[PDB]
Amino acid sequence: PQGNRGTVKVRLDTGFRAGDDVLVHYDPMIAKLVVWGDNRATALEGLRTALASYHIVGVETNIDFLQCCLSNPGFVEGGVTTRFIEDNSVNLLQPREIPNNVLALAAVSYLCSQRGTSTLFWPNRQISQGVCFTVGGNPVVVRVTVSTKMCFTCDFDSSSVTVYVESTTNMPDSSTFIRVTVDGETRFGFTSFVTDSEVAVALPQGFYTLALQPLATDFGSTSAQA
């Protein structure tokens, strides 16, 4: 959200719109986001909030790196040396953890994207589905059993997550707003964007993008001999 907010002023300057393709080795900068407050701490908090709300799907970015830099104690202390990036490389390049709730919600969102108006019904059975993501190069697989009441159960190692989808709404920006009840006691709404390669969820916890397991390029390859 750009403009004059409650306590800070946010200004975003970009040369790209939704649907544009950024070509490598030509102007790598996606955008510049400036936040003005009354004190440095307030400006940093506003920048953190604005970066948390900047949702980009399709191109890898350094939003997590910027969040790590902003939350670094050395940066928040005051002025830092030029080699600061080289000084806290291990700390700033820390991997971002993905809880099982995010995996379950992403799988449910992907399945809802697959579903049109058809009813999930198998007599005397729960419909079985599977969604494969890549987490750190690891091919994680989420097995989901879905009932006719639009209630998904996703299975992880010694873990089960129950997600009841109350309603869905297709936003004009090719995205979907989904109201869910996680387990039986956590009701909230979120926004999901499903491509052919990744699933993005804007949860109250933040913004996550999970890459689907890439398809093989030699699927059904019969080169006359082996």
Binding site: Q114, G130, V141, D196, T217, F219, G220
Partner: peptide
Amino acid sequence: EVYLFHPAQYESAPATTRPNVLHYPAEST
């Protein structure tokens, strides 16, 4: 690790990975 995808994923795939797409680039040189 075996049989992870669904055939509809290959049916709706980019031109690089869609298996029923003919790939005959021109040898312009």
